[PDB]
DNA sequence: ATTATGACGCT
DNA sequence: AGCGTCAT
């Protein structure tokens, strides 16, 4: 009843860039605007691996993961951007870059968590109860929200996408009481209103469309934003989640994807996220732990406490590279000559890092993969991190790993290794 | 022969 | 600590 907290208390959003690395690639090469193209890495194994895909060409069914031959079986006339190597691998500084673009223009409309590369939450509690001062009861206009879609509507007693999403958002308009400063419905649509500005900052400062959900916590806004993509953002109520939540695979649900999401599926017999309310929360915790239980039993009726983390940059700096097939290293010579091309990676970007933002690393984690092993990392140990030189760090590592070598000859290398993983950790002011 | 990342949970 | 899960 009266004491039911319903988890409305915050208006969080989620920004995620439309097609991102084409987009970077796009803005780079206008060549490349308004066609079907994906970027890709490396080149000679079946034309390199795609990893990302412009609109256009997801309408021809490439995907992330296709080898780019296999892809043009799809779409003959795709075009490609390759991602730049140096010192022998793949290097992702040009999306990098283009990422902290978009998280500094991000951070001045509020406190932002980056969550991946090209996405952040946005916690606009406190900037929404600022704009509901300046409006003074005022209405919202629907020329404020150019590009929201308000999910679950229209409902209730025209034939196009546009159509359609003008009714919806002129019914939610219509029902709102914009009298009540503390409103939850009203707090989100004046979210929403900030949120068109922020995007709009960013398409006009960096080229780049993005889309976002609007919520009341960052579960709901992250399902929101992937409902109309790209370059569209959708608000998502408390009062929405039953209908949403009613046919929606537990899958979707961010943190459900892997084997807890299908070990939900299997124990209680169910499919989708609204089926979850019938079980309490102490069922839930006996099956799946006291943490995961309750947050369930929250979840599925739309409320979760994950707090926006005021972080703006990554925690950890890390260089990778796999060595597939017959590429695997076999000799003492080669694990040493591949460490060195990490470290000077590694020694590149953390030196950068300690410049821009004034701190520096302390550990170094060193992560290896031998062959046959069905685990991604084999093998982790870590050492100290007290000098930005790579040749220290390559030295350090190998000396960290160099017992796992089986071979009984000095100079060959076995099992051999599959893969090299380098990373920055543990960062201290200075 | 997906690859290159990056955050957080468990014991 | 070192390993695992989940995610982009
Ligand atoms: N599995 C991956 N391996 C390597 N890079 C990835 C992978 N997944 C995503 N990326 C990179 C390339 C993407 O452009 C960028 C952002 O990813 P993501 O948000 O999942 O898709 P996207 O921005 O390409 O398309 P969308 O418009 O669907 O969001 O991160
Ligand atoms: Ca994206
Ligand atoms: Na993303």
Request: hydrophobic share 35%; charged share 25%.
């Amino acid at each position: 009843g009266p004491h039911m907290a319903t988890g409305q208390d915050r208006v969080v959003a989620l920004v995620d860039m439309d097609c991102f690395f084409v987009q970077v690639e796009q803005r780079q090469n206008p060549h490349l605007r308004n066609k079907p193209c994906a970027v890709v890495q490396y080149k000679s194994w079946k034309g390199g691996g795609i990893i990302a895909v412009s609109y256009e060409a997801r309408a021809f069914g490439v995907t992330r993961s296709m080898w780019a031959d296999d892809a043009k079986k799809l779409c003959p006339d795709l075009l490609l951007a390759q991602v730049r190597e140096s010192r022998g691998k793949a290097n992702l500084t040009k999306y990098r870059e283009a990422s902290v673009e978009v998280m500094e223009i991000m951070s001045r409309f509020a406190v932002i968590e980056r969550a991946s590369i090209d996405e952040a939450y946005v916690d606009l509690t406190s900037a929404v109860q600022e704009r509901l001062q300046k409006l003074q009861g005022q209405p919202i206009s629907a020329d404020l929200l150019p590009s929201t879609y308000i999910e679950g509507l229209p409902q209730g007693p025209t034939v196009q996408k546009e159509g359609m999403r003008k009714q919806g958002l002129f019914q939610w308009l219509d029902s709102l009481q914009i009298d009540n400063l503390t409103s939850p419905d009203l707090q989100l649509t004046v979210g929403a209103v900030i949120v068109e500005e922020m995007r709009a900052a960013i398409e006009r400062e960096t080229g780049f469309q993005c889309s976002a959900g609007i919520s009341h916590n960052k579960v709901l806004a992250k399902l929101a934003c992937g409902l109309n993509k790209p370059n569209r953002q959708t608000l998502v109520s408390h009062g929405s989640v039953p209908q949403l939540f009613s046919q929606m695979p537990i899958r979707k649900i961010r943190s459900l994807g892997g084997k807890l999401g299908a070990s939900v599926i299997e124990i209680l017999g169910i499919e989708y996220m609204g089926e979850l309310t019938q079980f309490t929360e102490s069922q839930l915790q006996s099956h799946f732990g006291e943490k995961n239980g309750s947050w369930l039993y929250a979840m599925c009726r739309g409320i979760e406490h994950d707090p926006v983390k005021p972080r703006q940059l990554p925690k950890t700096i890390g260089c990778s590279k796999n060595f597939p097939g017959k590429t695997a290293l076999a000799t003492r010579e080669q694990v040493q000559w591949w460490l060195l091309q990490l470290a000077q990676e590694l020694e590149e970007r953390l030196t950068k890092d300690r410049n821009d933002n004034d701190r520096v690393a302390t550990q170094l984690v060193v992560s290896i993969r031998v062959q046959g092993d069905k685990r991604l990392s084999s093998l982790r140990r870590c050492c100290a991190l007290t000098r930005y030189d790579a040749h220290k760090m390559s030295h350090d590592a190998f000396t960290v790993i160099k017992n796992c070598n089986t071979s009984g000859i000095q100079t060959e290398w076995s099992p051999p290794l599959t893969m090299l993983f380098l990373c920055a950790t543990k960062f201290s002011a200075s």
